[model samples]
Target: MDCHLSDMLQQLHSVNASKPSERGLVRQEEAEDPACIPIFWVSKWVDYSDKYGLGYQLCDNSVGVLFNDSTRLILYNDGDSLQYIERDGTESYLTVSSHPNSLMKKITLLKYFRNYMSEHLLKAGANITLPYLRTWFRTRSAIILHLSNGSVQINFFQDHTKLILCPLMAAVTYIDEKRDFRTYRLSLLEEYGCCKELASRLRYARTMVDKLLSS
Candidate 1:
């Protein structure tokens, strides 16, 4: 399938060529507001797929695992309940007080992942209520996260880079290989003339976001 990145790139170049001075950069004041803070995002991830699963911890302290058998388990921030999604998309809710034998091993592994995340990784404070992770999928180059609040996060495998598109803010946060966080208002990309690398990624992100919005 043809990606829209090419179309986006063409449009960007065309606009830049037509008018450069008329475009305006994102407002500094707007970018600094507390309300502009990005929604919940994946803070840490661990790959133990050889033995168990790919584990990730969200900024909200919720933990999740995509197991080798194609099932998923999530421990919410409250530490009280769990969400289990089977390969066929069957879902079940359970609490720490009562779970079946089939989930015992997975639950143990989930706890291990949570502990490792809390102990090994330094977390940033996120005062907002956490958004739930709805689902995730892997592509050849990246893993995509779909969150309950309509935010999408993409983590590139090769570069250790990440992109988060927040629908609420109409903004995109780029986490570079150096781990620096830069959030940009989407409309400002055309005006700001971001680096070529970021422009390319934004194109892909726009396409993905469009698809998600339509669905």
Candidate 2:
């Protein structure tokens, strides 16, 4: 319920209006750059598919994040539509355009580092700013730390190729990381998985690229 995040989402929604068919595909595939994917994405425990929309309805129970100015936009895929919360406390269901609101520049190394500390490892409301994601860091959980800026959470055991943590929000991530992005994936195979939507989307993008190359 962060006001800034909510505000940001509304602005991103306007941008999505231009191409509503591309929404929710972030979960189906991975992007070469994490920033190209949605800022934050959590997946669904169950699996289901149906042809029920602008295209073949490949759905996942997912959530996304975006920031605009000072507001944050949170996206939820309920199988039928996309729901979001705005900064002013308004909630609505809308079709999100298949696009990401790149915010990696807005998030810094310190921010993502602290994000992991406060949300997952540190105290419930704690905030710890670790300058670098160096090796040999030790800590326990369940205590409390200062809360500031934003948070990210991951529910999986491995990091998604399209996920980057910032000191600002990594702690809130449900996807796990082994210090950084370079040495991730299959390191902790089978505990959890990346977004289900990423694979199909990558194929989708590749097909588009190939067609353009043919000409």
Candidate 3:
């Protein structure tokens, strides 16, 4: 990893950084927000296995660490038993059929990977407003000026999706130790269309996950 890359990813394990949700993933006490959220960190990339074909096998192993203020998780979709590791180091295998430890059985798992732009804001060759995300969902558009084309501003909306209820003035959810918390899901095409590289990265990520689940 590049020195700057590792330096930035190290934040994933740090609890002091500002969380997407502080009082709650859905609620913030102020109008100012952090420039970005530290979401997932993939320290090392596993080369593809020739036997399984490109992007299918994780080689020796591959790991993706995801975390926020309250929770930390490691995902290894390495084999038949896709495992999710807990902060306390518990390992639970995901089953094809409904099973107790299926990672997709919750929302927070999805959010960690879904809400990923914040981590690569700088790498994607874009500039984000300091405190890029405005606090309250309805906190009147923080910028009233002609923001640059490459600027990324995030606003949270309350949970109106499926099984969550939270206020959003615009939103995202964070993971909890016991269970997942709910927050609004951001739209990829809507959020990153201006940045082709970023959009492509997300699309590839989704494709990889879909292949993992199907195979």
Candidate 4:
């Protein structure tokens, strides 16, 4: 587990370091700026790793699972097509209407997760082109997520706050415990630091980023 976690951290650190400067501008712009908007965000997530895997629902209504064996299965919003990515990163396209017998168990579990989300969780509506989750890991402080579109999101465990760093727009979006959202330029934080809680989280993020860069 440690090995996998270190690898995940290293990957996340590398991505953040490669374009540090380019990631802090979106939050500085006006609210209506396209850069300030997130293309897609996680609407819900459930940790069932002990029995199966971590399941999540995206804003677009797509559901996915990062299984215990390290493979992934995504049920697209259309409710017909499924994208299955193996542990080694090979992808197989399948359909819900008809799939191989071997995938029946996983497909069933994915549908269960989807049904759970639909019945229990309130959707966090927002999107454009969907950016799939690349990888994620839990630390004592936060759950860090790396998306396929070069964005990193950290959700703090203690205060229920979230920080999303978008490389394309070079900005950060913060969601507080009460669900209030705010966008800020990365540079802005340096000049006028945010609250102590956010500042500390940022510090942790930079530390991890620098650690990967130097190593």
Number of the top-ranking candidate, with lDDT as the measure: 1
Question: Which scores higher on TM-score, 1 or 3?
Answer: 1
Against the hidden true structure, what lDDT does model 1 obtain?
0.68
- Between candidates 3 and 4, name the one with more favorable lDDT: 4
Residues 1-215 of candidate 1: C-alpha lDDT, one tens digit per residue: 22233343344344345342343443322332334458579888777778887888888678988888888888988997898888886888998678678799999999999888888865432333444555566778777777756677888888878887765665677778777777766555544555556666666665555554455
How do the residues 1-215 of candidate 2 rate in per-residue lDDT, one tens digit apiece? 44123332332233223332354433212212333222322221111112110100011223222233323332333422343445553555444453224423322321333233334442211121101001111113111111123212222223332222223321112222332222112111112223433323223323322322243
- How many clashes (backbone atoms < 3 Å, residues ≥3 apart in a chain or on different chains) does model 1 have? 0
Query: By summed lDDT, which 10 consecutive residues of candidate 3 come out lowest?
Result: 128-137
- In terms of TM-score, the best-performing candidate is 4
Minimal lDDT window, size 10, model 2: 129-138
In model 1, which runs have C-alpha deviations exceeding 4 angstroms? 1-36, 122-150, 156-161, 167-169, 176-180, 203-215
User: What is candidate 3's lDDT per residue for 123-196, written digit by digit as tens?
Assistant: 21112110011111112321110001111122112221111111121122222222233223222113222223
- TM-score, one value per model: 0.65, 0.20, 0.22, 0.73
Position 192, candidate 3: lDDT? 23
Each prediction's number of clashing residue pairs: 0, 49, 9, 6
